[PDB]
Design a protein around this ligand. Structure first.
Ligand SMILES: CC(C)[C@@H](C)/C=C/[C@@H](C)[C@H]1CC[C@H]2C3=CC=C4C[C@@H](O)CC[C@]4(C)[C@H]3CC[C@]12C
Ligand SMILES: CC(C)[C@@H](C)/C=C/[C@@H](C)[C@H]1CC[C@H]2C3=CC=C4C[C@@H](O)CC[C@]4(C)[C@H]3CC[C@]12C
Ligand SMILES: CC(C)[C@@H](C)/C=C/[C@@H](C)[C@H]1CC[C@H]2C3=CC=C4C[C@@H](O)CC[C@]4(C)[C@H]3CC[C@]12C
Ligand SMILES: CC(C)[C@@H](C)/C=C/[C@@H](C)[C@H]1CC[C@H]2C3=CC=C4C[C@@H](O)CC[C@]4(C)[C@H]3CC[C@]12C
Ligand SMILES: CC(C)[C@@H](C)/C=C/[C@@H](C)[C@H]1CC[C@H]2C3=CC=C4C[C@@H](O)CC[C@]4(C)[C@H]3CC[C@]12C
Ligand SMILES: CC(C)[C@@H](C)/C=C/[C@@H](C)[C@H]1CC[C@H]2C3=CC=C4C[C@@H](O)CC[C@]4(C)[C@H]3CC[C@]12C
Ligand SMILES: CC(C)[C@@H](C)/C=C/[C@@H](C)[C@H]1CC[C@H]2C3=CC=C4C[C@@H](O)CC[C@]4(C)[C@H]3CC[C@]12C
Ligand SMILES: CC(C)[C@@H](C)/C=C/[C@@H](C)[C@H]1CC[C@H]2C3=CC=C4C[C@@H](O)CC[C@]4(C)[C@H]3CC[C@]12C
Ligand SMILES: CC(C)[C@@H](C)/C=C/[C@@H](C)[C@H]1CC[C@H]2C3=CC=C4C[C@@H](O)CC[C@]4(C)[C@H]3CC[C@]12C
Ligand SMILES: CC(C)[C@@H](C)/C=C/[C@@H](C)[C@H]1CC[C@H]2C3=CC=C4C[C@@H](O)CC[C@]4(C)[C@H]3CC[C@]12C
Ligand SMILES: CC(C)[C@@H](C)/C=C\[C@@H](C)[C@H]1CC[C@H]2C3=CC=C4C[C@@H](O)CC[C@]4(C)[C@H]3CC[C@]12C
Ligand SMILES: CC(C)[C@@H](C)/C=C\[C@@H](C)[C@H]1CC[C@H]2C3=CC=C4C[C@@H](O)CC[C@]4(C)[C@H]3CC[C@]12C
Lengths: 459, 351, 311
C-alpha cells in the first residue's frame, strides 16, 4: 500500500472506434500522478478508479463490462463499446403520458462521443413530437457538452381548451461542475401557434390565439444533494430557471424576463426505540416565479406588452399543489384555466413506512399540506391608460408587479391537504393520494377524490 | 380537321362521360361543320393543359382548356363554317353558366363519384373501358378524388348517398331540389314561354343534366327525383339527345374513324408508359408534391407559349446543377465515412 | 358509500375567496359593453369601424350595420373563430370572469334580431330561383378573381403581405411560412372552380398558381360584372330586385365591389404595360357604371359618416 511503485505503462482494451485524443485528455493526468513516487498504491490506485468514471460519462462504452485488470506495474483496463445504432422503438412507463418513443440513436459519430438522437413520440395530450438532436462534448471534456436540437411538436392544453404547435431549434450548452451542480445555458427560437380551440374556449384564449415567435436565452442551475431524487428522505435540492426573451439582440413577438426558483429538502427522524434507518422523514418545498414584461429593444425604459397565455405560469395538479385539477389555480376565464404572472407554492409532507414492511421498500405513506398562489398582472394601479392599449410604460409595469406580489401576502393561500401512498420506482415516481381542498378562490377547480400522479418532479 | 377536341371516351350511351366534355361535344355538333372538327378520346395526362375538354386549334397550334375557354376562343376566331331585353338573355346565360359549374357539378359528383356503391358499379367500369390498360389504376382515383372535393361542401357522404335512412334520403332530396329548382325556370327546350339563354348555356345544361338521368345506376335516387318531380327537364334531355346525338353519337367525326381508334394516336407504348410513370411519381411521398408542381409549371409554359405569349425561361438548369452538387457531397460523405480506417486502435499504450 | 361520503364532502372547502382577476391583456380586449364582431382589419380601422379588407368578413359586417345593431369590431385571426374562420361575434361579458357562448357567422342575423337598437326579414329572405343563379356569380366568379389577384398575382404581393402576414408576426421566418400556406390554400379553392381550374394532376388538389388558368378566371369575372350590372339595371329602385332597402344580395356584392375599388384599383400605367385591366377598374366600367353607384349608395347607408372611401 505505502510502497512506492509507479504504474508507468498502461494499456486499454476495446477502444477501436474512439480517437486516441479522447483517451489522451483523460489518461495523461493519471500518468503524471505517478511522478510523485510517494505512497503510489495509496495515491495512484485511487486515481485510476476516480478516472474510470470519466470514461463512463461519454456513454460510448458499455458500463456493464467495465472491468479492470491488475498486473506488475502495467495496468490493463478492458471495456466494450455500445452499438453504433439503437432503434429503441419502445413505449414509456414512468412517463406514462410519454406514450411511445421511437428513439433512434447514432452513437460515437466522428470518434468522439457525438450522438444524433432522432426521437419521435405520439400519445395522449401530445399529438406528435419529432425531435432531432446532435450532442457533442467540447474539448474532450465529458462534463461540458454542446447540443443542437430541432423540434416540431403539437402539444395539447385541455385545461385552456386549445393546443399549441411548436416549431423551432435550440442551442444548448450543458455543463457539470466539479461540485456536482449542473449549469445549462440554452438559446431557443420557437414558433408558437395556438390552434384547435374547443367550443367552450374562453374569450381570453381566443384573444391570445394566433402565431408568435419566442427568441429567448435561458439559464438553468440545479443542485441536487438529495440521496434519492425519486424518494427524497435526506438532503436538499435547489433549482433556478431564468429566461430572457425578446430583449436586446433577441428578436421576437414576445419580450419578458421570466425567473423561477425551487427549493426542496428532507430531514430524517429516528425513532428512539428503533435502531438503524427508521425510514421516517419530514420534507418541504417552496417554488417562486416572476414574469416581468419588457420592451423590445436595447433600452430598459419603454412600453411593454402584457404577457400572453403561452408564457404565463400554470399552477395546480399532481406535480403542482395537490388537491386541485391540473392547472386548477390562478385566474379562470369561465371554465378555461388562464395563466398568471407571479406565483408561490409550498409543501410540507412527512413520509412514513407501512407496518410489517422493511424501510428499504420503495412503498411509503405520505401526509402533505400543499399550498400555492397564482395571480395575474394588471394595470389597475396606473392613473389612466393611453389610447393605444396593450402598451404599459415602465412605471405601470413596475407598479403592476408590486401589486401582484403584494396580492400573494394578503389572504390565506389556496391550501389542500391529504394522505396517500407513494411508489419510488427509479424511472419515475408514482403517487396515489386522497386529497381534500380546504381554502381556494372562486372559479378554481379542486378534486376531493382519489388523485393519481406520476412523474419525476413533485411539490 | 381545322380543330381537334380532346374529350373523355363515350359512356352510358353518351358521346362522353364528363359533363364538361359532353357539353363541348354538343356545342361543336350544332355549330361547327361535320368535317371542320375531330373528336379525340384522351385523358388529362395526354394533353399539356391537364384539363378536359381541351381544344387544339391546328391553324395556330394553340392549346385551349375548359368548356368556357373553348366557346370563347371559337367566338373570337370563328372557323370558316361556324354558325352560333337582348342584354337580359346574355346576362342570364352568364349567371346560369356559373351556376351549373358551381352547384350542378357537386350534385353530379354525389350521384356518380361520391357514392361508393354507384362509383364501383357504373362509373369505375366506364372509365376503364376508355383508357389503355395501365391507366385505370391511376387516373380514375385522381378524377374521383377531385370530384369528391367538388361535392365536399354538400355535406353528404357515401353512406348518406343511397332509422338511418329516414332522414338520409331527406338530405339527398333537399340537395337535389335546390339545384333542380333553379334550372327548371330556364326552359332549355327553347319553346314558348320561359327564359331565353344562349346556345352555349343550353349545351352546358344538357351536359350536366344528361349525366344525372341517362346513366343506369344501382342507386338511382337522382334519376327518380328528376323524373318524378321535374318532367319538363327530363323531356328536354331526351329530346336534345335524340336530335343532337342519335344512336349515341356514332356519326360524330371521331379521329381514325372510331372512338377507341382516336385514342390510339397518342396511346403508343412509350407514351402510355410515360403517362403512367408520371402518375406514380406524383404519389411518391414528399417528392411527388414537388414533381407534380414542377411538371405542372412545365406544362403551363407549354400552353402559354402556344397561345402566343413569351413566358420567362425557368431556372431548371440551376436545379440540375444544384442536384448534381447534392450527389457529390453525399458521395464524398459515403466515400469518407465508409472505407476509412477506424478512429481508434484495439490496443492503446502510453509510456 | 356514496351517501355517507356526500354528506361530508360538501363541508369542504372551508373558506372560499373572490375569483382572481383576469390578466391585463384579457382585461383590455375581452372587456366591453357592446357585442364585438371579430373581422380581418387593422387597429386604426377598428377604432372607426371601417369596412374590413376580407370579403367574407365584410359581407357579414355590412349586414349587421343594416340591422341597426350596436356593435364594435376588433381585428382577429381565423384561429380564434368558433367555426375555424372569421367572422364571429362575442356578446359582452355578464360577469368579469364569465362570458356567453360565441355567435358564429351563420347565427349573426338571429342574434341581431334578439337585440334591437326588429323586422330583419329582408336581410335573410330566401332568394327567387332566378336570383340564385346570379348569386353564383358573386360567391364563385367574383370570389375566384379576388383570390387569384390577391394571393396568386405577384403584383399584389406587397398588399397581401401587409394585410395578412405582416400583422401576424414580426419574424421574417414565420411570415414566409404563413405566406406559403395562405397562397397554397387560395390556390386549392380557385382550383375547385370550373371557371379557371379543373386540372387533374394527382390524387391531391392543385395548390399552386401554375395549375390555375388566370385568363379564364379574369374572363369569368369580367362576364360576371357585366351580368350583375344588367341585373341591377332591371330594378326600378337603387337596389337589386326592386327593394326599397338593401338586402343580403346587395351586401354579398358590396363585399367584393368595395374591396376591388379600394385595393385592386391600381394605376393605368401598370395596367397598360401588363395589358390587363385591374379588378377595381372593371367594377367601375361594368355596364354603364351601375356597379359603381351601387357601391357608393351602399356605403352611404351602412357607413354614412365615412368620407375616405374613394380608393
Ligand atoms: C447534514 C450535513 C451533511 C449538512 C451539510 C446538510 C444540511 C442539509 C442537507 C440539512 C440541514 C438541515 C436540514 C433541514 C432543516 C429543516 C427543514 C424544515 C422542513 O420543513 C423541510 C426540510 C428542512 C429545510 C431540512 C432540509 C435539509 C437540511 C437543510
Ligand atoms: C437568463 C439570461 C439572463 C442569461 C443571460 C443568464 C445569465 C447568467 C444568469 C449566467 C450567464 C453565464 C453564467 C455563468 C458563467 C460562469 C460561471 C462560472 C462558474 O464557476 C460559477 C457560475 C458562473 C458565474 C455562471 C453563473 C450564471 C451566469 C452568470
Ligand atoms: C420548505 C422550504 C422553505 C425548505 C425546503 C427550505 C429550504 C432552504 C431554505 C434550505 C435548503 C438547503 C439549505 C441550506 C443548505 C446548506 C447550508 C450551508 C450551511 O453552512 C448554512 C446553511 C445553508 C445555506 C442552508 C440554508 C437553508 C437551505 C437553503
Ligand atoms: C455545521 C455546523 C457548524 C452548524 C453551523 C450548522 C448547523 C445547521 C444544522 C443549521 C445552520 C443553519 C440552519 C438552517 C437555516 C435555515 C433554514 C430554513 C428554514 O426554513 C428551515 C430550517 C433551516 C434549513 C435551518 C436548519 C438547521 C441549519 C441548517
Ligand atoms: C405552504 C405550507 C407550509 C402550508 C402548511 C401552509 C401553511 C400556512 C399558509 C397556514 C397554516 C396555518 C394557517 C393559519 C392558521 C390560523 C389562522 C387564524 C385566522 O384567524 C387567520 C388565518 C390564519 C393565520 C391561518 C393563515 C394561513 C396559515 C398560517
Ligand atoms: C420609469 C421609472 C419612473 C422607474 C419606476 C422604472 C424603472 C425601470 C427601468 C426598472 C424598475 C424595476 C426594474 C426591474 C425589476 C425587476 C427585474 C427582474 C430581473 O430579473 C430583470 C430586470 C428587471 C426587469 C428590472 C429592469 C429595470 C426596471 C424595470
Ligand atoms: C405499380 C408498380 C409496382 C410498377 C413498377 C409495376 C408495373 C408492372 C407490374 C405493370 C405496369 C403495366 C402492366 C402491364 C401493362 C399491359 C399489359 C398488357 C396485357 O395484355 C398483359 C399484361 C401487361 C403486360 C401488364 C403487366 C403488368 C405491368 C407491366
Ligand atoms: C393482365 C391484365 C389483364 C390484368 C388482369 C392484370 C393486372 C395486374 C397483373 C397489374 C396490372 C397493372 C398493375 C398495377 C397498376 C398500378 C398500380 C398503382 C400502384 O400505386 C399500386 C399497384 C398497382 C395497382 C398495380 C398492381 C398490379 C396491376 C393491377
Ligand atoms: C417491350 C415493350 C415496349 C412492350 C412489351 C410494350 C408494353 C406495353 C403494354 C407498355 C404499357 C405500360 C408499360 C409499362 C408500364 C410501367 C412500367 C414500370 C417501369 O418501372 C418499367 C417499365 C413498365 C413495366 C412499362 C413497360 C411497357 C408497358 C407494359
Ligand atoms: C403544518 C402541519 C404540522 C399541520 C399542523 C397543519 C395543518 C393545516 C392543514 C391546518 C392547521 C390549521 C388549519 C386552519 C386554521 C384556520 C382556518 C380558518 C378558517 O376560516 C378556514 C380554514 C383554516 C385556514 C384552517 C385550514 C387548515 C389548517 C391550515
Ligand atoms: C409558498 C407560500 C404560498 C406559503 C408559504 C404560504 C403563505 C405565505 C405566502 C404567507 C406570506 C404572508 C402570509 C400572511 C400574511 C398576512 C395574513 C393576514 C391574516 O389575517 C391571515 C393570514 C395571512 C394571509 C398570512 C398567511 C400566510 C402568508 C400569505
Ligand atoms: C428511386 C426509388 C428508390 C424511390 C422513388 C422509392 C421507391 C420506388 C421503388 C417507388 C416505386 C413504386 C412506388 C409506390 C407505389 C405505390 C404507392 C402507394 C401509395 O398509396 C403510397 C406510395 C407508394 C407505396 C409508392 C412509394 C414509392 C415507390 C415504392
Amino acid at each position: 500500500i505505502l510502497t512506492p511503485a509507479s504504474i508507468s505503462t498502461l494499456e486499454v482494451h476495446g477502444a477501436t472506434n474512439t480517437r486516441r485524443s479522447l483517451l489522451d485528455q483523460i489518461f495523461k493526468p493519471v500518468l503524471e500522478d505517478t511522478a510523485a513516487a510517494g505512497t503510489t498504491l495509496g495515491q495512484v490506485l485511487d486515481r485510476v478508479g476516480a478516472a474510470t468514471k470519466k470514461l463512463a460519462r461519454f456513454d460510448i462504452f458499455k458500463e456493464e463490462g467495465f472491468g479492470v485488470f491488475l498486473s506488475e506495474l502495467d495496468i490493463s483496463i478492458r471495456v466494450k463499446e455500445k452499438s453504433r445504432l439503437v432503434f429503441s422503438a419502445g413505449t414509456d412507463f414512468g412517463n406514462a403520458e410519454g406514450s411511445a418513443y421511437t428513439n433512434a440513436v447514432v452513437r460515437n459519430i466522428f470518434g468522439g462521443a457525438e450522438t444524433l438522437t432522432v426521437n419521435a413520440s405520439t400519445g395522449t395530450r401530445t399529438r406528435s413530437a419529432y425531435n432531432a438532436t446532435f450532442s457533442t462534448p467540447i474539448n474532450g471534456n465529458p462534463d461540458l457538452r454542446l447540443s443542437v436540437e430541432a423540434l416540431r411538436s403539437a402539444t395539447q392544453k385541455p385545461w385552456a381548451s386549445h393546443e399549441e404547435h411548436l416549431t423551432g431549434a435550440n442551442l444548448r450548452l450543458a455543463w457539470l461542475t466539479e461540485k456536482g451542480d449542473t449549469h445549462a445555458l440554452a438559446y431557443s427560437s420557437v414558433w408558437r401557434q395556438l390552434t384547435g380551440l374547443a367550443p367552450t374556449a374562453s374569450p381570453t384564449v381566443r384573444a391570445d390565439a394566433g402565431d408568435s415567435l419566442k427568441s429567448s436565452l435561458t439559464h438553468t442551475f440545479t443542485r441536487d444533494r438529495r440521496d434519492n431524487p425519486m424518494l427524497p428522505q435526506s438532503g436538499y435540492l435547489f433549482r433556478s430557471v431564468s429566461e430572457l426573451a425578446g430583449w436586446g439582440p433577441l428578436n421576437g413577438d414576445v419580450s419578458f424576463a421570466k425567473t423561477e426558483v425551487e427549493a426542496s429538502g428532507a430531514l430524517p427522524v429516528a425513532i428512539p426505540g428503533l435502531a438503524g434507518k427508521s425510514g421516517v422523514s419530514v420534507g418541504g418545498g417552496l417554488r417562486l416565479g416572476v414574469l416581468y414584461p419588457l420592451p423590445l429593444g436595447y433600452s430598459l425604459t419603454g412600453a411593454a406588452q402584457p404577457s400572453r397565455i403561452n408564457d404565463r405560469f400554470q399552477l395546480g395538479g399532481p406535480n403542482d399543489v395537490r388537491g386541485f385539477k391540473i392547472g386548477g389555480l390562478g385566474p379562470h376565464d369561465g371554465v378555461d384555466a388562464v395563466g398568471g404572472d407571479v406565483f408561490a407554492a409550498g409543501s410540507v409532507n412527512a413520509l412514513l413506512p407501512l407496518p410489517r414492511t422493511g424501510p428499504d421498500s420503495p412503498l411509503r405513506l405520505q401526509l402533505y399540506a400543499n399550498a400555492g398562489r397564482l395571480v395575474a398582472l394588471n394595470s389597475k394601479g396606473t392613473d389612466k391608460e393611453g389610447k393605444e392599449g396593450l402598451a404599459m410604460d415602465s412605471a405601470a409595469v413596475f407598479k403592476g408587479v408590486k401589486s401582484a406580489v403584494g396580492k400573494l401576502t394578503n389572504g390565506i393561500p389556496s391550501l389542500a391537504a391529504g394522505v396517500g401512498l407513494v411508489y419510488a420506482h427509479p424511472v419515475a415516481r408514482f403517487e396515489l393520494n386522497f386529497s381534500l381542498p380546504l381554502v381556494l378562490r372562486r372559479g378554481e377547480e379542486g378534486r376531493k377524490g382519489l388523485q393519481v400522479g406520476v412523474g419525476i418532479s413533485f411539490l | 380537321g381545322a380543330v381537334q377536341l380532346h374529350v373523355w371516351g363515350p359512356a352510358f350511351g353518351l358521346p362522353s362521360i364528363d359533363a364538361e366534355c359532353l357539353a363541348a361535344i354538343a356545342y361543336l355538333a350544332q355549330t361547327l361543320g361535320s368535317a371542320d372538327y375531330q373528336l379525340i378520346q384522351s385523358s388529362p395526362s395526354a394533353v399539356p393543359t391537364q384539363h378536359l375538354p381541351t381544344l387544339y386549334d391546328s391553324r395556330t397550334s394553340t392549346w385551349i382548356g375548359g368548356f368556357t375557354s373553348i366557346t370563347a376562343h371559337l367566338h373570337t376566331h370563328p372557323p370558316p363554317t361556324f354558325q352560333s331585353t337582348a342584354a337580359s338573355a346574355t346576362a342570364d346565360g352568364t349567371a346560369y353558366t356559373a351556376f351549373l359549374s358551381a352547384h350542378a357539378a357537386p350534385l353530379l359528383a354525389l350521384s356518380l363519384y361520391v357514392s361508393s356503391a354507384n362509383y364501383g358499379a357504373a362509373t369505375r367500369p366506364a372509365y376503364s373501358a376508355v383508357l389503355p390498360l395501365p391507366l385505370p389504376w391511376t387516373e380514375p382515383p385522381a378524377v374521383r378524388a377531385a370530384m369528391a372535393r367538388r361535392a365536399a361542401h354538400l355535406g353528404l357522404s357515401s353512406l348518406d348517398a343511397d332509422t338511418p335512412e329516414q332522414k338520409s334520403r331527406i338530405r339527398l332530396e333537399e340537395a337535389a331540389r335546390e339545384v333542380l329548382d333553379v334550372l327548371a325556370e330556364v326552359d332549355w327546350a327553347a319553346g314558348g314561354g320561359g327564359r331565353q339563354v344562349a346556345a352555349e348555356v343550353r349545351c352546358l345544361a344538357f351536359g350536366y343534366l344528361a349525366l344525372m338521368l341517362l346513366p343506369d345506376v344501382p342507386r338511382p335516387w337522382l334519376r327518380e327525383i328528376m323524373e318524378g318531380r321535374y318532367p319538363a327537364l327530363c323531356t328536354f334531355v331526351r329530346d336534345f339527345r335524340a336530335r343532337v346525338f342519335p344512336q349515341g353519337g356514332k356519326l360524330l367525326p371521331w379521329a381514325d374513324g372510331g372512338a377507341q381508334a382516336s385514342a390510339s394516336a397518342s396511346a403508343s407504348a412509350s407514351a402510355v408508359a410515360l403517362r403512367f410513370v408520371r402518375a406514380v411519381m406524383a404519389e411518391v411521398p414528399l417528392v411527388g408534391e414537388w414533381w407534380s408542381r414542377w411538371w405542372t409549371a412545365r406544362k403551363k409554359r407549354e400552353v402559354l407559349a402556344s397561345k402566343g405569349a413569351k413566358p420567362a425561361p425557368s431556372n431548371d438548369l440551376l436545379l440540375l446543377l444544384g442536384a448534381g452538387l447534392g450527389l457529390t457531397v453525399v458521395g464524398a460523405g459515403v466515400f469518407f465515412y465508409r472505407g476509412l480506417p477506424p478512429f481508434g486502435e484495439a490496443v492503446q499504450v502510453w509510456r | 358509500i356514496p351517501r355517507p361520503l356526500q354528506r361530508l364532502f360538501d363541508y369542504f372547502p372551508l373558506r372560499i375567496y373572490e375569483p382572481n382577476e383576469l390578466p391585463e391583456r384579457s382585461q383590455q380586449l375581452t372587456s366591453g359593453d357592446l357585442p364585438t364582431l371579430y373581422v380581418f382589419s387593422t387597429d386604426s380601422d377598428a377604432r372607426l369601424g371601417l369596412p374590413s379588407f376580407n370579403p367574407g368578413c365584410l359581407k357579414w359586417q355590412t349586414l349587421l350595420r343594416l340591422a341597426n345593431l350596436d356593435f364594435r369590431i376588433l381585428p382577429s385571426t381565423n384561429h380564434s373563430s368558433p367555426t375555424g374562420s372569421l367572422p364571429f361575434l362575442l356578446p359582452p361579458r355578464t360577469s368579469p370572469t364569465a362570458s356567453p357562448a360565441p355567435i358564429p357567422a351563420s347565427g349573426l342575423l338571429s342574434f341581431a334580431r334578439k337585440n334591437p337598437w326588429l323586422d330583419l326579414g329582408h336581410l335573410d329572405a330566401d332568394l327567387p330561383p332566378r336570383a340564385q343563379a346570379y348569386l353564383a356569380l358573386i360567391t364563385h366568379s367574383l370570389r375566384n378573381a379576388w383570390l387569384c389577384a390577391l394571393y396568386l398575382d405577384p403584383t399584389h404581393d406587397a398588399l397581401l403581405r401587409r394585410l395578412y402576414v405582416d400583422p401576424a408576426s414580426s419574424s421574417r421566418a414565420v411570415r414566409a411560412a404563413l405566406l406559403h400556406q395562405l397562397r397554397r390554400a387560395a390556390a386549392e379553392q380557385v382550383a375547385t372552380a370550373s371557371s379557371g381550374g379543373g386540372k387533374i394532376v394527382s390524387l391531391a388538389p392543385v395548390d399552386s398558381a401554375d395549375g390555375i388558368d388566370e385568363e379564364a378566371v379574369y374572363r369569368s369575372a369580367r362576364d360576371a360584372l357585366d351580368a350583375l350590372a344588367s341585373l341591377l339595371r332591371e330594378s326600378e329602385t337603387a337596389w337589386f330586385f326592386g327593394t326599397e332597402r338593401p338586402g343580403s344580395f346587395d351586401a354579398a356584392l358590396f363585399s367584393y365591389t368595395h374591396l376591388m375599388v379600394e385595393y385592386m384599383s391600381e394605376e393605368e400605367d401598370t395596367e397598360s404595360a401588363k395589358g390587363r385591366v385591374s379588378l377595381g377598374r372593371m367594377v367601375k366600367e361594368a355596364g354603364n357604371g351601375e356597379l359603381a353607384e351601387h357601391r357608393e349608395r351602399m356605403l352611404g347607408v351602412a357607413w354614412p359618416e365615412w368620407d375616405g372611401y374613394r380608393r
